[PDB]
Write an enzyme that holds these catalytic residues in place. Structure first.
Site, short mmCIF file in Angstrom:
data_model
loop_
_atom_site.label_atom_id
_atom_site.label_comp_id
_atom_site.label_asym_id
_atom_site.label_seq_id
_atom_site.Cartn_x
_atom_site.Cartn_y
_atom_site.Cartn_z
N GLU A 316 7.24 5.90 5.91
CA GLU A 316 6.11 6.59 5.88
C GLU A 316 6.55 7.92 6.58
O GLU A 316 5.12 8.69 6.21
CB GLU A 316 5.10 6.45 7.50
CG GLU A 316 4.21 5.42 7.08
CD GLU A 316 3.14 3.91 7.78
OE1 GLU A 316 4.05 3.75 8.75
OE2 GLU A 316 2.67 4.30 7.47
N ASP A 325 -3.76 9.20 2.42
CA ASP A 325 -3.09 8.30 2.31
C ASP A 325 -2.88 7.67 0.88
O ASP A 325 -4.03 8.49 -0.11
CB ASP A 325 -3.26 7.24 3.04
CG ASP A 325 -4.29 6.26 3.54
OD1 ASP A 325 -4.88 6.56 2.58
OD2 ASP A 325 -4.31 5.55 4.09
N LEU A 337 -3.76 6.73 11.09
CA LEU A 337 -4.86 6.63 10.46
C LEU A 337 -5.94 7.78 10.81
O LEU A 337 -5.76 6.52 12.66
CB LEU A 337 -5.65 5.42 9.67
CG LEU A 337 -6.24 5.46 8.76
CD1 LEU A 337 -6.07 6.56 7.75
CD2 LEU A 337 -7.06 4.06 8.40
N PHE A 409 2.72 -1.51 10.59
CA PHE A 409 2.80 0.54 10.56
C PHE A 409 2.02 -0.03 9.72
O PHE A 409 1.40 1.22 9.10
CB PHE A 409 3.40 0.60 11.11
CG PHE A 409 3.59 1.87 12.27
CD1 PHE A 409 3.81 0.48 13.06
CD2 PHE A 409 3.33 2.99 12.32
CE1 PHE A 409 3.64 1.74 14.67
CE2 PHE A 409 3.15 4.03 13.14
CZ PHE A 409 3.58 2.99 14.33
N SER A 422 6.74 -16.98 5.62
CA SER A 422 8.33 -16.20 6.47
C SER A 422 8.49 -16.32 7.46
O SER A 422 9.37 -16.22 7.97
CB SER A 422 8.14 -15.02 5.25
OG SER A 422 8.36 -15.13 3.55
N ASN A 437 11.25 -15.36 -0.02
CA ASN A 437 9.66 -15.53 0.12
C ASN A 437 8.84 -14.92 0.12
O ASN A 437 7.65 -14.93 -0.31
CB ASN A 437 9.70 -16.44 1.11
CG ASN A 437 8.06 -17.84 1.64
OD1 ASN A 437 7.78 -17.02 1.60
ND2 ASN A 437 8.40 -18.22 0.91
#
Ligand SMILES: CCC(=O)NCCNC(=O)/N=C(/N)NCCC[C@@H](NC(=O)C(c1ccccc1)c1ccccc1)C(=O)NCc1ccc(O)cc1
Length: 463
Positions: A316, A325, A337, A409, A422, A437
């Site tokens: 990130e 973003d 954010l 996140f 999953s 998956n």
């Protein structure tokens, strides 16, 4: 009144017969540790001194340690060995007193150096904002360690006596005129208080502190500079010292508390095996430094074949100024954010509340790390409140927990729980079946594979 004569150990198993083969084997073993100790430490002392590094605290303390191990090899080691075999002290009363004193000084000098090194390495990873370890600080440490080691070992120099009194009981009528080098403390209480002092202040105590240091270092790095090979080496030096001394510590302590035991033959052989094991620690340290060289390891491996913050700073990025973003929303730091509103003043207000200062759309790396710490803390409490996230997280290790935190996140607490298929397989340790998956791989393929590999392997291959 001869209360001192009752504080002398008793021996009575004159029928001590070891095969020459075993004695010769011990002479070669002691001979090997004497040469490796003198050669290895001298080389280590000279190599560190000749290699001029402007700021090296750790290696100055390793010179300290290896010089004390060089002292034992010359002053103690050969004398202790032949004395056990001959079964009578043929050296002076000076060597008699120096033998346990110098050995005791060296144990304390080695372990309290290892204590300071653990502190040095703890200060470099836990508090790098302070960066307190300096060469001048180490020079005071070594002078304090030696002065205190000597003062705390003086009862050996004082009460170790070259005596023939124990020979009275074992016949000896009447031709030998031989002497033994035994400790003769003032009382049973004086001996037990001092021996407990040595055990707690030079063994159990210092090792507890060191292990706590390396564990605090271990746990920090998992939550979070190619000196990883060094930290593993230094830890393996403490483990080596502790493991080499443990049999002798057990042996001696049994004799300190049960001083009325008649020292047999078996106890002489048992002492030699224990003592030799403790002497191995005086020559392993340079062999650790020698095997540390990357080129020699590359030759070896070719002949014989044999973290959340860092993960997210890559996935990130780290920004110290407000940015938009992919969705256009005002972000800062590591994907933090602020607001989904079009206003910049609203974002700056939310930022000023979070930090508790007039940032003016700009923060420091510390304020960025704290904001991330607050983010991951809020992310982990949300995982626990979630019924699908709380069981899969608990079963997952610190490396795979970082990948699940990385996922929250990006999407959020509700987005990650949407992976019902999953999450079930990751909970059942079926990682490869879960890795194969969703739109998540479609939007960002590079980032999604970086976290999938960490879920599958359980290590930092992609990072
Ligand atoms: C050992 C590590 C430790 O940190 N121990 C903390 C607690 N107790 C402790 O250190 N006790 C003693 N008595 N130290 C001096 C040991 C001298 C000698 N051992 C013996 O003669 C013992 C013995 C008994 C029967 C047969 C053969 C040998 C013996 C032990 C106890 C009483 C009498 C004789 C020996 O091991 N010498 C090497 C040495 C010297 C100083 C030192 O601090 C550590 C090691």
């Amino acid at each position: 009144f001869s209360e001192k004569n009752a504080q002398l150990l008793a021996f009575e198993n004159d029928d001590c017969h070891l095969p020459l083969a075993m004695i010769f084997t011990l002479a070669l073993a002691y001979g090997a540790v004497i040469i490796l100790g003198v050669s290895g430490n001298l080389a280590l002392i000279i190599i560190i001194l000749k290699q001029k590094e402007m700021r090296n605290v750790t290696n100055i303390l390793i010179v300290n340690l290896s010089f004390s191990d060089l002292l034992v090899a010359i002053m103690c080691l050969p004398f202790t060995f032949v004395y056990t075999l001959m079964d009578h002290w043929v050296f002076g009363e000076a060597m008699c007193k120096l033998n346990p004193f110098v050995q005791c000084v060296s144990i304390t000098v080695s372990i309290w150096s290892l204590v300071l090194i653990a502190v040095e390495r703890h200060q470099l990873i836990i508090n790098p904002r302070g960066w307190r370890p300096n060469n001048r600080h180490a020079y005071v440490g070594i002078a304090v360690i030696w002065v205190l080691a000597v003062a705390s070992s003086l009862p050996f120099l004082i009460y170790q006596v070259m005596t023939d009194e124990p020979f009275q009981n074992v016949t000896l009528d009447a031709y030998k005129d031989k002497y033994v080098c035994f400790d003769q403390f003032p009382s049973d209480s004086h001996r037990l208080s001092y021996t407990t002092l040595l055990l707690v202040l030079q063994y159990f105590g210092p090792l507890c502190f060191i292990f706590i240091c390396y564990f605090k270092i271990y746990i920090r790095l998992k939550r979070r500079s190619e000196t990883k090979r060094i930290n593993i080496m230094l830890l393996s030096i403490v483990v080596a010292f502790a493991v080499c001394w443990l049999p002798l510590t057990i042996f001696n302590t049994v004799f300190d508390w049960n001083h009325q035991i008649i020292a047999t033959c078996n106890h002489n052989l048992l002492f030699l095996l224990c003592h030799l094991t403790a002497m191995i620690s005086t020559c392993v340290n340079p062999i650790f430094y020698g095997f540390l060289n990357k080129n020699f390891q590359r030759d070896l491996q070719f002949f014989f074949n044999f973290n959340i913050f860092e993960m997210l700073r890559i996935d990130e990025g780290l920004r110290l100024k407000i940015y938009k973003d992919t969705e256009g929303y005002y972000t800062i730091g590591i994907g933090h954010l602020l607001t989904k509103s079009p206003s910049l003043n609203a974002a700056k207000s939310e930022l000023d509340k979070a930090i508790g200062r007039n940032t003016n759309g700009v923060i420091t790396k510390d304020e960025a790390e704290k904001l991330f710490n607050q983010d991951v803390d809020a992310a982990v409490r949300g995982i626990l409140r979630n019924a699908k996230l709380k069981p899969v997280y608990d079963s997952l290790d610190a490396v795979r927990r970082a990948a699940l935190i990385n996922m929250v996140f990006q999407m959020g607490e509700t987005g990650v729980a949407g992976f019902t298929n999953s999450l079930r397989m990751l909970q059942q340790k079926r990682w490869d079946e879960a890795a194969v998956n969703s739109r998540w791989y479609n939007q960002t393929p590079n980032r999604a594979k970086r976290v999938i590999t960490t879920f599958r392997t359980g290590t930092w291959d992609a990072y």
